[PDB]
Amino acid sequence: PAYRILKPWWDVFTDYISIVMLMIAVFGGTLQVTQDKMICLPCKWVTKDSCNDSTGPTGIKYDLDRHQYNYVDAVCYENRLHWFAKYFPYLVLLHTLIFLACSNFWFKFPRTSSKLEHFVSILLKCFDSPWTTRALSETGVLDKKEGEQAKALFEKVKKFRTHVEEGDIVYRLYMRQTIIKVIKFALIICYTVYYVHNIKFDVDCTVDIESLTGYRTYRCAHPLATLFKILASFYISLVIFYGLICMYTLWWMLRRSLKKYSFESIREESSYSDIPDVKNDFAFMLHLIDQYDPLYSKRFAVFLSEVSENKLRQLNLNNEWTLDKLRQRLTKNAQDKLELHLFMLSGIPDTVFDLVELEVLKLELIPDVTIPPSIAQLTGLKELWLYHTAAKIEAPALAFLRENLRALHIKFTDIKEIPLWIYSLKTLEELHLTGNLSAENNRYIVIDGLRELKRLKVLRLKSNLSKLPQVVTDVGVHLQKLSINNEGTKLIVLNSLKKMVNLTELELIRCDLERIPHSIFSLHNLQEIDLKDNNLKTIEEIISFQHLHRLTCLKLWYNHIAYIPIQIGNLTNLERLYLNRNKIEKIPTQLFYCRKLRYLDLSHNNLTFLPADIGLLQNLQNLAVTANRIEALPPELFQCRKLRALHLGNNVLQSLPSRVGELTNLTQIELRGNRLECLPVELGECPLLKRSGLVVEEDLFSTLPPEVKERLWRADKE
Amino acid sequence: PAYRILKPWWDVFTDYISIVMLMIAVFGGTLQVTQDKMICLPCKWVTKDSCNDSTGPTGIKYDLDRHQYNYVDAVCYENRLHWFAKYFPYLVLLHTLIFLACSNFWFKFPRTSSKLEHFVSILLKCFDSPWTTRALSETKSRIEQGIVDRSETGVLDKKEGEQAKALFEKVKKFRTHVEEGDIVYRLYMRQTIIKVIKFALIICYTVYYVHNIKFDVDCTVDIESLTGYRTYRCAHPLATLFKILASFYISLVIFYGLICMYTLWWMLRRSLKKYSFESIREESSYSDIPDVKNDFAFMLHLIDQYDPLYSKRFAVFLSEVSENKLRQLNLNNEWTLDKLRQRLTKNAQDKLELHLFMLSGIPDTVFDLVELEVLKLELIPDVTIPPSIAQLTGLKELWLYHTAAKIEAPALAFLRENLRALHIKFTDIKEIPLWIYSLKTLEELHLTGNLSAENNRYIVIDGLRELKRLKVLRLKSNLSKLPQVVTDVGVHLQKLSINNEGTKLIVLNSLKKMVNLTELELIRCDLERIPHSIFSLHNLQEIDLKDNNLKTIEEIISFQHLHRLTCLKLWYNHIAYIPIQIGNLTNLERLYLNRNKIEKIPTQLFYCRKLRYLDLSHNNLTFLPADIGLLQNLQNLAVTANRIEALPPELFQCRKLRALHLGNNVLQSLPSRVGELTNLTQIELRGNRLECLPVELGECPLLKRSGLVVEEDLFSTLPPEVKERLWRADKE
């Protein structure tokens, strides 16, 4: 089987010694059974209960028959022959049996037999493991299944180490076996040496049988005495060898202190400092194997180490996410940037850094990531997204990011999930925070390091804030763009916003303002204002926007704005005006004094008509009145020569005015959902219009002339 | 083979001691067979029927032959040698053989042999199954909001998953088979009791009789006619060795008896008819392992004495948590991405839909479908929303039908950022997840199921105020009064829909604050009267009052306040008549009055020239006023199930009347002006008292056979040109 490896040289020697001892026991026993004779002749002249030893010679006549001789031989054997000379083979058999019991007690004892078989099974599967030879040769692609096997093997070795290190049972069994062997060898050597001299050939008995034989004493020969003395001396030699071997084993056990196995030699040779010392009953079996072979312990150490487990995980990951699969999976975001999205992986594959074309890296739900120093290979990396993925960084990686990272996106479920090293970056221009960070009695404590971003320009917060933090006010002295998305939670300004005089784009989305704060007018460099979803109802404060001489875009959409103040005519610099999803029912004529206007979106309002002053907007380029009650478009609308789009969908339009063809810059027109009976023939004289550009019901489109329809199909096809 | 697991250490010790005792039995037996001697010499001087024991020495002459000595020694061996000395090895052989038979009966007896081999086979195949190590390795505001901690997942082979499923099934069957027997345990108990009583008997008698093995024996056998002597003194040369063997045997049996006493003490103190399993599950948290009944706890106790490792490798397969987890893995393997994509359908709103019904859980691979739009979950129990749901970028609606689902922080954040609609249907308040009030981008909430309770009403929905982006709120909960939170949150609601399914709803001045509302629905509210709070909603456009048991709808005069009221459904009521005040609502476009008790149509109804839909199905109308042709924009006119015997010719002035429904009427004959309606597309005519269809019916440019719903007897009257044209139009 496989138990030949748990036997050291000394156990093998003792096994063979016990076999030889058992052989001489059986030989002596069969002799003592089949011959076992004394031959006793009476002595006629007796001196002090001893034989006096005092025409040719004639034989002496004792007048004894065969049966009287048999009786005296039996009596003198029973009484005067020494018990050693008679029972030597049975003593030898008993001693060899109890020696074999001491040897195999731990093999037959189930409590330790289970441990030994488990240990040998695990060691066997580690020795033949394909990853062992690979890892020791390396000092590269593998099967996924074999990697799963190796991971299961690491878990198995973890369980084995947990179960065994508390044992202290196999070691105690071996120690007690060897102690018993030593004491028994000492005792048997003692008594056997003391008594081997009583195996004499010639014996004398004075057995007091004279009423049965007439003679007092007898002189007897024990023919098997010399063979038995030879066998006994051979046995004392064998027991001496057995005892020397057992004393060596006892000294080895008492010397090495095998409750602790250092294991550090291989951990230094193969450079695995994460190979700790194994404890009692786990050190011992390793020592026994080391006696058989250190190679098995070498193959076991790699599965016992922690760093090798990490390398195995990395190799499985590289097998799972190769360079080809990653490059094929590479996509582009909406920002015309090359980005890679890693979602729910055990770690960062080491092959992602061989794609030097990357610019944005997204790490979402990747547990316990360490930012490898290999990120230096990503020369062109500009944005790193850490979504529910806290990153532990090293000094080289931190130094690289301090000079190569321009935008950082952090989405966290908890304060602790925010890396603390991200603030130390100095070239960082964009910080995107997405998560609730409000705290009680320690509000705005985590992000105090925000001031350290001296190059910061874009700061977007989506953080359930109830007031603009003071640290943000300090860091805003160098900001260009601000974006706060409280998700409906009210935000308080209270004169904490005017310090960002360099701010040029301010967004207060879902901040529940309920009224435009006066602090917005103190940002004279502001160029875009986005106040989406703030429950605004009165926007008469826009008269103060004349202070902002550089205001070009106004997004007041997604509010409950009931009316457009006529004071909106004073915002002469407006080019984009977004007002959709509001309660506006009519368009004041003052709104058309903003001649520079280019984007005018008034969708999803309660409008019914367009004032004729819409022809004043020569720079109109987009017009969205989607989902309105616009009965008919005034012909003055077509005075907007460069109108490049028209969103009239979901209206109550009766007939499309025929002047639609004059819009030669018209590229996209939407008309779906209208009660439009007929289509104009002048729709066919828009050079840039295609069938995709025109949005209208197919059955209504069937009303257009075949020439116009064919021309539109030809333009849309190519 | 694999039976070594059964025997504890005392069993092995007894087996080895029995081997030793059998060895000494065979040794003593061959000694007694091959030597078996008494060496006897006559006693010349005899005192009290016994030996007296009283020019150099000379031998004593008895004048006996060798054969006379053989005879006397044979007789003295037969008679005066103690029976114990003669038959001790045979008694030892008998006792050791019966000890071995007692040990091995439960293995050789087929009734218990089959049970033992079945248990060992199943235990071995559950030891070799790899699911065990994986199971072993698997190991405030946040708690009360359905937020659960992260749990890891893996991928397992389909073949090994099926093997583990079959192994769970086989272990179930075997436990059922074994729970009733209690035969192996009884046989083992009887074997141990026999062993102990036999030990007691043999120790007692052997120790009593061992003193009769003497070397020197006196026999007075009464053979004087054959030898001339009365008494003899004999030597038994095997007596001392037999005494050594006998005392060695009593020492061995003392060891055997102490071992068996300890074994019986253990088997009585332990109470091993039931298996506890408390430590493994109390540490590793797998409480779905019930205690074990008879004949299946005894074998596990044996295993525990041998090795607890097998006990755990079996406990994992006997647990129910593990079975459900393996079921999850098998369901993951079964519902492959191709299967789910083939299962994907599109709901009425042209959205890709996945409706899961009666599954043990949400398959982990439903979240690899990037095109999924609506996820419907019905009758899926004790399920967790995994963080992998964040891959469903296009997911907009989540339907939780009788499903209480817990969520994790990543999935909760993703849904809070992405989820638009939520359908909650519950028979219990606790089945409503409490994390649904933290979805701050939610826009459309459908509450289905009774929610009100005594002394604690309208407190679970106290969290609706946190849904700051809610627009569509559907309340189908048998409300006896509109909850205060609904009034508070309705300031930004754009559509409120209530379905009391027969319960009377009292608005009681709680509806005039939702000035942003544009659609109001009160279905089966049993109002029996239009509440005056509706007319204060100056932004309303659609008002539905279905199944309110309305009788008089003269309240519609106040609808002139609503300056954008386009659709107004009053269907499924007891409305006896249409008040003439319905003409003041010139902005009406859709008007529904079907399933009512209307008998006549006022002429003032045709002052609404913006009307486009006029459905009067299932009424007692008998004629149509001539002003019906004034509504130039009417497009759908259904008068199904009425008493319209004839249609006015002015009705065909509505040239854009796309569809008609004149079925189930008493129409005597179809007017010839039916061809004037150029835009007619779908006209229903089944159920009328018509005889012949008009020829002018076929001149409609767009009407097809699909749009001409009529009986075949009437349809047979069309000219064959008309029939062929309709068939061709239906084909194309």
From Swiss-Prot, chain A:
GO cellular component annotations of the record: cell surface; lysosomal membrane; monoatomic ion channel complex; plasma membrane
Residues the record marks as site: Required for anion selectivity: R66
Organism: Mus musculus
Membrane topology of this protein: Multi-pass membrane protein
Cytoplasmic topology ranges: 252-718
Record function comment: Essential component of the volume-regulated anion channel (VRAC, also named VSOAC channel), an anion channel required to maintain a constant cell volume in response to extracellular or intracellular osmotic changes. The VRAC channel conducts iodide better than chloride and can also conduct organic osmolytes like taurine. Mediates efflux of amino acids, such as aspartate and glutamate, in response to osmotic stress.
UniProt-listed InterPro entries: Leu-rich_rpt, Leu-rich_rpt_typical-subtyp, LRR_dom_sf, LRR_domain-containing, LRR_R13L4/SHOC2-like, LRRC8_Pannexin-like
Motif Di-leucine motif: chain residues: 616-617
Name of protein: Volume-regulated anion channel subunit LRRC8A
